[PDB]
Amino acid sequence: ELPKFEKNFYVEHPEVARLTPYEVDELRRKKEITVRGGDVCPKPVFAFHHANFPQYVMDVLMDQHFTEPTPIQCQGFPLALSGRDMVGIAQTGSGKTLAYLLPAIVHINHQPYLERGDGPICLVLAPTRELAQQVQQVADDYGKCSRLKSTCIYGGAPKGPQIRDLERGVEICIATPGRLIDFLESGKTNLRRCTYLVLDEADRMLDMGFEPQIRKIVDQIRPDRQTLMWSATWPKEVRQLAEDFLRDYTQINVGNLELSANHNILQIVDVCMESEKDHKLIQLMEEIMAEKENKTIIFVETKRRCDDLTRRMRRDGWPAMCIHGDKSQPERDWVLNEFRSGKAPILIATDVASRGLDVEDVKFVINYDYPNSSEDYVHRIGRTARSTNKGTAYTFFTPGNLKQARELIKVLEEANQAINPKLMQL
């Protein structure tokens, strides 16, 4: 007794249709694409015009001076445009956002118009407020010359304007889970029209803190929806759990199937004692801040250490500001915007800034504290070397971090990085 709908909007372009099985295999080999699943996977595309996006989307793309789709776009576009459930795993900074947003636009464009009272057609869930806001900004860039309406549903901002967006009608909603659950409970929106569901940073969204919130939301979406999950990491602990939210899905990987970092990052690991970190940070910042572009993110383990380090650095004269979950949302957005503009070129952060954020010209990531997992390491260092850029990561590793040493060495080896002998000694 539910309304019928379509989700397959894909026809192979003739240039893709006429690829031989050998040419398709060589395309996947050269782009390091692996596909797994029960149904035959569509061939990868290799040019944007193979996707038959609307002309206004092509104009924004051709603006960006992208010369070709990234590997995850090459395989993700035709899978998503074909209406398939999918998990897309690809390196940080490799274009996963447009891999799900552009097929969302195509999906929306083929659905019946929104009538007053209708909820969103596309829902994208993200683990942090700033990431949700960033994704909405990308969506609006590509739907600017269309009649597509978006909103960002997230905590720490006034409800009024969000409620008015939902009441007027939005085709795409980007949300963090808490505020969305709030609005769903009180009937400020509903998911009766949601047929395209994206979990960005999906392995984070399926962790112990988020999974009950995600389950509460996704339980309200029709099971014949299309579900698309994306991340740079896919640890064993979330894999069978993810299948609770997927039907007849295909998994795409780019690069190594094990945990791996973006190979455009120069990864440096300094094995030292906890007491040596502050002196070594000052030495490092003295070298970094004498360079032309010096935009740097410094990651620490706790909100308290974030505050303490920022206070100490600002007193020593460094133009540093911090972002963490105990700051007000206006202060969080203000600090991130000053970092984006370069007015505050040093950002000190908890893991609130470890995933998804795409900031122009970050040249250095410093792990002042090694993170809680090697997956977090891969996301943190991926704040640099995004798109066709390189960058550097510098990590302080203490004997207290020993239990993480083996997994860190494997990541370094997979990325062809030089291994500090003091690290291998551990």
Next chain:
RNA sequence: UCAUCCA
């Protein structure tokens, strides 16, 4: 630990 509704 860190995120994630405080109206």
